[model samples]
Target: MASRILLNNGAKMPILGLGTWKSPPGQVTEAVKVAIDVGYRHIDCAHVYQNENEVGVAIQEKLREQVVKREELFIVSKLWCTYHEKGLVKGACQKTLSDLKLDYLDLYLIHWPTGFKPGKEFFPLDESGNVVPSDTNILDTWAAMEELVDEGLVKAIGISNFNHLQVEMILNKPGLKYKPAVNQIECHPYLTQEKLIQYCQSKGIVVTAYSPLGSPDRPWAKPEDPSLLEDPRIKAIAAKHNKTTAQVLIRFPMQRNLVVIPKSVTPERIAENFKVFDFELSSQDMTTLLSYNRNWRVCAGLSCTSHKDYPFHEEF
Candidate 1:
C-alpha cells in the first residue's frame, strides 16, 4: 500500500504519484500499468499531456483484473489555461473525465495562473511567428474553479504554480466557496521554497513538490543544468543508505511532509520511485540536504514574469 496524506478537506491523497508530463504516447500506458503493479495508487495526469486516453485504458484494465479499484486510486487532473473561461472550466473537466473514463476526479487544479483564450494553445504565435503572452485574468478563471467543487464535479479544487500573493488573492476573494486545498510548486533540494511551504502549511493548504529529481528529463533544460541525480552531495548520502540518488531526492520531500510527483515512463524507474516509503531519511540528513539549496527553478514561463501581480520577484 502507498503512504497517504489527508487533505484539509479530509480526503486521503497518496503522497507519491506518477507524473505523466512529457511521457511519450507509445509507452505511457505500459508505464501506468507498471506503476499500478508497483503499488502507486495516485496517477497525476493532465489533458495537456495528451495521454489521458492511454492512461485511462491502463487504469480500466487494472480495475478489471482486481489489481485496484477506482476508489482506491487518487486520480488528479488539471484545468489547462485554455479552459479558464467561465463557461469552459466545466466542459474542459468533463472532456478530461471522458478521456480518462472517470465520473469525477479526486483532485482538480487550475494548471497555471495565466489564462488563455478558448482554443488557444500555451504558446500562441505572434506576427513574426514567435510566441507571445495571451492576456487573460487568472483570478476570474479561479472564480470559475471555485464552482467546480460546489457542483460535485471535483472533490477538491486547488492551484498549481501559484506563488504566495496569488494564492492569498484567491483565498481572500469574496463569494469563494472552496478554498484551495493545495498549491503544487516546483520543489527539490535546489528550490526548497521554505517560506512558501510554511505559509501554505499555516493556512491549511498542502504543498506538493514537482520536478523532485531536478527534472533531468526536461527537454528545454540545457545539459549544463545541474543534474540532481549526478550531484556529489546527493550521491554521498545515497551511498550511506545504499539507495539511489533519485530515491534520496524523492525521500527528501516526503520526510518534510510534502507530496511529490516524480515523472518516469521507464518501468524499472516507475517501480524505483515507489520504493521511497520503505526508508526514512534521518533529521540530520535532511538538515544536511537543506544546506545545498541554491533556489534553482527548472520550470519558468515567459508570461509569469510579465504579470503585475507576480509574487516571486517581489518580497513577501
Candidate 2:
C-alpha cells in the first residue's frame, strides 16, 4: 500500500493513484480491476475522459468480490469546462456520480481554470474551430463547488491547471467556505513546477502531480520530443538504484512531498508503478532530476488559450 496525504479538509488521500486519461473504454475497465488487485486504492478520473461508465463497472465488480470497500477507496473525477456555471455544477457532478455508480465522490476537481460555453458539447467549438469561451468567473464556480460538500455529494473539492493568482483569488473570495483541497497540474522532470508547488503547499493545499513520467504517449507528442523515461540521465540513476526509469520518475514527486498519479493499462506496469515505496532516491539524484527541468509542459491546453481564465500565461 502507498502512503496517504492529509488534505486541508481533514480527509486522507492516497499519495499515488491510477490515472484514467487517454485510456480506452474497453481497456480501462480491465485496467481498473487490475490496479485494484495490485493494491491501488486511488483512482484518478475525469468526465472529459468519457470512460467513467467502464471504470465504474470495474469498481462494481471489485466491490462485489469484496476486494475493497466503498469507504476504503479514494475515487476522483473532474467537472468539465462546459459545466462551470453555478447552476450547472451540481448537475455535472451528479452525472459523474451516476456514471461511476457511486453515491458520493471522495474528490472532485474543476477540470480546468477556463470555462467553455455551457452546453452538451464537450468542446463547444465555434465556426472557426476555436473553443467558445464563457465569461463566468471561477470564483462563482468555487462557491457552487463548496455547496457540493455541504450537500454531501462530494467529500472534497479542488482545482486543476490553476495558476497562483487564480488560487489566491479563490482563497480571498468574499464568502469562501471550503478551500481547495488539491491543485492538480502537469508535473514531471521536464516541467518540474517548483514555484507553483511551493506556493500551493504554503497555502495549505496539496499539489497532485499529473504526467509524472512526461506522458510520452500523449496525443500530440512529436517524434523528436524529449523522452523522460528514455533519457540517459534518468536511465543511469535507475540502473544505479536497480529500478526502472518509470519507477524513479514516480518517486521523484513523492520525495518532494507531493502526490502522484501515473497511468498504465498493462498489468505489469501498473504493479511496477506502485513498488516505489520500498526504495528512496538519494539527495544527489533528486538534485540531478530537478536540474532536468526545462519548463516544458505536456498537458498544455493550447486550444483554449483565448479563454479569459487561461492559466498558462502566468509565470508559474
Candidate 3:
C-alpha cells in the first residue's frame, strides 16, 4: 500500500504522487499504467497538463483489469488559468471530467491566480506574444467553485501558486463559502517556503511541494540553473544511507510532513521514486539540506508575472 497523509478534511492522500507535467503525449499512458502497477495510488493532474484523456485511458484500463478499484486511488485535477471566470468554472470541470472519464475528482485546484479570457485558447496572446488577461474577479471564480463541492463534482477545492497574501484575501472575503484544503506551491530546497508553510498550517491549509527535485530538466532551464540532484551536499547525505539523490530529495519534503509529486517518465525511475517511504532522514540531514535555501523559484510562472494577481511578487 502507498503511504498516506491526512488532509484538513480528514481524508487521506498519498505522500507521493506521479507528476505529469512535460510528460510526452505518447508516453504518459504507459507511464501512468506502469506507475499504478508499481503502487502509485495518487495522480496529480491538471487540464493544463493537456493529457487527461490519455491518463483517463490508463486509469480505465486498470479498472477494467481490477488492478485496483476506483475508490482505492486518489485522483486530482486543476482548473487552468483560462477557466477562472465565474461562469466558466463548472463547464471547465465538466470538460476535464469528460476527458478523465471520472464522475468526480478527489481534489480540484485553482491552477493559478491569474485569470485569462475564458475561451478556446490556453494562453490568449497578443501579436507580440503577451498574455491577454481576463477582467474577471477571482473572488467570483471561487464563488462558483464552492458550488462544485456542493454539487459533488469534486471532493475538495484548493489553490496552486497562491501566496500568503492571496490566501488571506480568500479567507477574508465577506461571504466566502469553502476553505481551500491545500496550497500547491513550487517548493524544494531552493524555494523552501518555510514561512508560507507555517502560515498555511495556521489557517488549516496543507502545503504540497511541486518540482521537489528542483526540475533541472525544465525546458526553460539555463545552464546556470542549479541542479539539487547533483549538489555535493545532497550526494553526501544519500551516500550515508545508500540511496540515490532522487531518494534524498523525495525524502526531504516528507521529513517536513509535506507531499511531493516528482515527475519522470522512465519505468525504472517511476518505481524508484516510490521506494522513499522505506527510509528515514536524520534531523541533521534535513536541516543541512534546507540551509541551501535561497528562496529561488524554479517554476516562476514568468508569463503571468505582470498580471495583478501574480503570486510570487510578495514575500511568501
Candidate 4:
C-alpha cells in the first residue's frame, strides 16, 4: 500500500496511524511523543479514550520545538454518543479542539451510530428501560458535521461502525451536504471485513483498521480468549519473513490498501510497529492470511447490542 491514501475530499491521510484505544494513561504522553518522533503523522483519538489532555502535551511540545509543522501532522477526533444532536455537534468538536490544544482537526467522525441524548447527565433513558445510545436521526448529525467544514473547525467528516445500508441512508438523504470520508472499524485476520472494505473504497471512502493486532490487550478479554498475535499460523509466516508477529500482522492490512492503527504504550513496541514499510508480504503469504478469516469479531459491541440501529445484524 502507498504510504498515504487520498480521501474523497482530496486530502491525503497516512495509511498507518497511531491507535489510542487502550493506550495506558500514565505513559500515553510519552507514547504519543515517541510516535511523532518515529514518523507517524496520523493519530486516531476519541473523547471517550480520555487521554487527549496528555496527548496534547506531546503535540504542543513537538510544535514548540519546531519538530513538525502544525499543517503537516494529521489529527483526528470523534464526536461522542452523548453529543449527536445538531446543536451539540459543533460544541463537542470545540471541546475536543480545546483538549487536543488545536484550532481545528484534520478529520472528525461520528463516534458511533448510537446517539445519546443531550442532558445534565451523559446518558438519559428512554421508554425502552435502557439508556438510549441512539436511534436518533443520523441525517441531522451529518448536516451539522458539514457545517463544521464550512465553519473551519474540521477538514473532513466521516462515520464509524456504520454498515452499508446505514451509509446508503446518509448518501440517499434529500439534501445530503457532505459524503462521509471514512468508515473506521475493528479489523484483523479474524474479522477481515473484505466486502465492506471494497464497498467503501468503491465509493472513494477509506477504511481504517483499528485493533489490527486483534486487540490482545482489550479490557474485556477473558483468560480463555484466543490470541491472534500468538496463533501458530501467523507465527510461522513471521518466521518465513524473518519478522516479528506484529510486523506481519500490520503488513497484511497495509497490503490490502487499508489504513491500520495498532496501539502500544511502550516506546520500543511503538517504534517497532512503524518499521513495516520496508518489506512487502508476498501474494502467497497474503492468501495464507486470508484463509484465517473466520468472521470472528473481537469487539462485538455486546454492551450496546440492544440499540435499535445495531450494525452487526447485517452481513457485510
> Which candidate number maximizes lDDT?
2
For this target, which candidate reaches the highest TM-score against the unseen true structure?
2
Model 4: per-residue lDDT, tens digit, 1-316? 5789899888999988898877767888899999999999888999888888888888899989888999888999999888888888889999899989999999999988888767756567777657766545888888989999999999999999898888888888889888999989878888888888988888888898888998888888887877889999999999988889999999998998888889999889999999999888999999889888888777787767777777888896
Models ranked on lDDT: 2, 3, 4, 1
Writing each residue's lDDT as its tens digit, candidate 3 over 1-316 gives 2488778767888889999888888999998999999999888999988899998888889988999998888888999988887778999999988898899999899999899876789999989888999987668878888899999998888888888999998888779888888889988888888899989988888788999999876889888878898899889999999999999999899878788899988999999998997888888888888899988778788888899898888988
For each candidate, the alpha-carbon lDDT, in order, equals: 0.85, 0.93, 0.88, 0.87
lDDT (Cα, tens digit) per residue for candidate 2, span 77-146: 9999999889999999999999998999999999999899998799999899999988789999999899
TM-score of 3: 0.97
- Deviation in Å, model 3, residue 306 alpha carbon: 1.8
lDDT of 1 by residue, 1-316 (tens): 2489889889988999999999998999999999999999999899998999999988889999999998899999999876777888899999989988888899999888766556647556557654444455667777887787788888898989888888888888877677888899899988878888998988999999999998887878886677889999999999999999999999999988899999999999999888886787888999999888888888866445654434467442
Candidate 3 whole-model C-alpha lDDT, 0 to 1: 0.88
For candidate 4, what is the lDDT?
A: 0.87
True-vs-predicted CA distance for residue 274, candidate 4, Å: 0.2
**lDDT measured at residue 167 in model 1 versus the true structure, 0 to 100:** 85
Model 1's C-alpha root-mean-square deviation from the true structure amounts to 1.9
Cα-based TM-score, every candidate: 0.94, 0.98, 0.97, 0.96
Candidate that beats the other on TM-score, 2 or 4, i.e. the better one: 2
| Residue 270 local lDDT, model 1 | 92
Q: Which residue ranges in model 1 land beyond 4 Å of their true spot?
A: 128-136, 308-312
The clash count for each model shown is 0, 0, 0, 2
